[PDB]
Amino acid sequence: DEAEASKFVEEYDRTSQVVWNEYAGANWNYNTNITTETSKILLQKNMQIAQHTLKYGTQARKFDVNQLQNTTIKRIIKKVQDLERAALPAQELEEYNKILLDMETTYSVATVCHPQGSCLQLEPDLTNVMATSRKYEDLLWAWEGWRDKAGRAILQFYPKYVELINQAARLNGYVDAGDSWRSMYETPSLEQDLERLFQELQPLYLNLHAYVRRALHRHYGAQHINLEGPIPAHLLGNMWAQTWSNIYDLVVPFPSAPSMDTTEAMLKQGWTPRRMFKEADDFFTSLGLLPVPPEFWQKSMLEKPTDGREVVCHASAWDFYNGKDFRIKQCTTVNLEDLVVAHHEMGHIQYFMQYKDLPVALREGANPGFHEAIGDVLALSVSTPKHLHSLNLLSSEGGSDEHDINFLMKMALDKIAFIPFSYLVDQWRWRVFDGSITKENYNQEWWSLRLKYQGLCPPVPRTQGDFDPGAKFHIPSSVPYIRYFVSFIIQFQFHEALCQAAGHTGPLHKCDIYQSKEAGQRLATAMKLGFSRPWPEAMQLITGQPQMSASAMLSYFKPLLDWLRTENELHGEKLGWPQYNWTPNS
Ligand SMILES: *[C@@H]1O[C@H](CO[C@@H]2O[C@@H](C)[C@@H](O)[C@@H](O)[C@@H]2O)[C@@H](O[C@@H]2O[C@H](CO)[C@@H](O[C@@H]3O[C@H](CO[C@H]4O[C@H](CO)[C@@H](O)[C@H](O)[C@@H]4O[C@@H]4O[C@H](CO)[C@@H](O)[C@H](O)[C@H]4NC(C)=O)[C@@H](O)[C@H](O[C@H]4O[C@H](CO)[C@@H](O)[C@H](O)[C@@H]4O[C@@H]4O[C@H](CO)[C@@H](O)[C@H](O)[C@H]4NC(C)=O)[C@@H]3O)[C@H](O)[C@H]2NC(C)=O)[C@H](O)[C@H]1NC(C)=O
Ligand SMILES: CS(=O)(=O)N[C@@H](CCCCN)C(=O)NC[C@H](CC1(C(=O)N[C@@H](Cc2ccc(O)cc2)C(=O)O)CCCC1)C(=O)O
Ligand SMILES: *[C@@H]1O[C@H](CO)[C@@H](O[C@@H]2O[C@H](CO)[C@@H](O)[C@H](O)[C@H]2NC(C)=O)[C@H](O)[C@H]1NC(C)=O
């Protein structure tokens, strides 16, 4: 009966709101106050949500979706039929939860020590070294040490993790965990579509790579940089070489056109974490989008506590599944990078608020990439030299062609450099999950892809027992990553569309959509759909067409592509890494 299915969905919604809200609370209380007691309560709520998922998922599977007429009810019931880890038998579920906790803990407590010296945590100690050191051996100590202490220590857990997460996927009707993850996009052509996008960005990435490689050759010396080979992976300013903007000082196109030190400016002018989030809130409401509720300001953790609590510091945004309580947890630091992260996280909060009236089963983004993109779209406008000057964080940089190319290079060092990294992570994981990479070659296959996609090599030859993927957070925390590749493509599509809605003309990279109500209306209509419709509908609401496309990103960076090609040609660069077998001699 249509009526029995409707009743079921209503009962699922009521009970899920209660159970998910209790789990969100317990998880928040652990994350903002790590103790034995909060771990204990969290463990109990984890089991309560499993029992709820098992109960309602079992019921949902008794419905023949084929016989359901109402498409919304059909959609919800089909989704509740996927129990995820709660499909595992009791022993395997306990084992899986424990392996996940052990991997996450191992990663979070790993430190790198000098003998009879200080021990450095990843954040901020080791990331600061990677960002600021310009000494090959000091960078190497941090890069190798982090892999030695975090990566190698995850390896013992990962094969059993793969076995259990695949078993859960098969018990929910998928062939492996990678299949299950890809299904979140509801797009049978996903793999080919993503490959096509990656290929469209190759001219830009290869030209950026070759230009940066030449700059590294200048600084680190001819004996350590092969101008026809891959770049050593510890020289890009970031522990994973996923974004390169911390080496802007080594690659600036026009050193004669200097830029203000934005961190020093923010500190001198008394910026605080709360001010950073108020600025993000203001951008959202300038578009006519929703302000965060008063409760957000009361309950959020917007900087590291000084009351003796120990906390999880990573930036994060939290839906408590009651339509009222939304929070950010971030150990915010006062700099421009974290101002952008604040906008990223506030985009997650905005999406939570926009879809709060849907059934909790449809309270997700159109696809996971959409959820990641919203905040970054606003941050693109924030990052314009125009807007940064209005915050008193830059001197006037408009007009000047040199400042213009310098700005596009700054943007490309993050946005373009990240495209191959964000593609790589789940290309590797999909092949682990489908069994075509075994524990015998986890690491070799990781580096084959680091080479193939990013054009990087490890500065020190890897050895047996190395497990460098484990040194990247999302691997031991089992967080899918292709969402970030999707996000970095489509956020430029959204920027282009909103800039057009706002009446912007001229180069896309000069657009600042601040206070555009037309831009806000486009985003709001799409966000309010949550996960109720196939994501091409939200794509069309924003952009006027239904596809993912790299064209907007290419248009944004067109002046840099032209500059890079001219620069690389006059130095005779050989794009790519035909000497792909090269690795450092010392
Ligand atoms: C197939 O079934 C689906 C699902 O049906 C729903 O679920 C099943 C299981 C059963 O329970 C059904 O009884 C139930 O309807 C059908 O899809 C639904 O279709 C109805 C149309 O009949 C749509 O009605 C709209 O719903 C919105 C949102 O409603 C939530 O939020 C409201 C605001 O907080 C609140 O009032 C509601 O009670 C509801 O509350 C939330 O409910 C969810 C669970 O669903 C729960 O998780 C949340 O916790 C809970 N939140 C809170 C806070 O309680 C409602 O806002 C709409 O009102 C507008 O539209 C009317 C029609 O146009 C109009 O008369 C109203 O005045 C109002 O109009 C707008 O007003 C503004 C300003 O005044 C104006 O600017 C706008 O232009 C104007 N809109 C206009 C003119 O269009 C309305 O009631 C459901 O949204 C929809 N649900 C989903 C999920 O899609 C589907 O129709 C079925 N298909 C077929 C072919 O039959
Ligand atoms: C805890 S939750 O699950 O309930 N809520 C999720 C978000 C809603 C999911 C909806 N279903 C959440 O808070 N997640 C945390 C995660 C943290 C960040 C993260 O890891 N970023 C990746 C990739 C990246 C992204 C942007 C960028 O510029 C550079 C890199 C990384 O750093 O490698 C670190 C700061 C930027 C995001 C996030 O916000 O997406
Ligand atoms: C951090 O967590 C501990 C453990 O839950 C909290 O301590 C509890 O505090 C309440 C009073 O509010 C007592 O009723 C419990 O008995 C306490 N338990 C223990 C083990 O001490 C503590 O309040 C939390 N701190 C913060 C700042 O939230």
Ligand SMILES: [Cl-]
């Ligand atoms: Cl690595």
Ligand SMILES: [Cl-]
């Ligand atoms: Cl994803």
Ligand SMILES: [Zn+2]
């Ligand atoms: Zn995010």
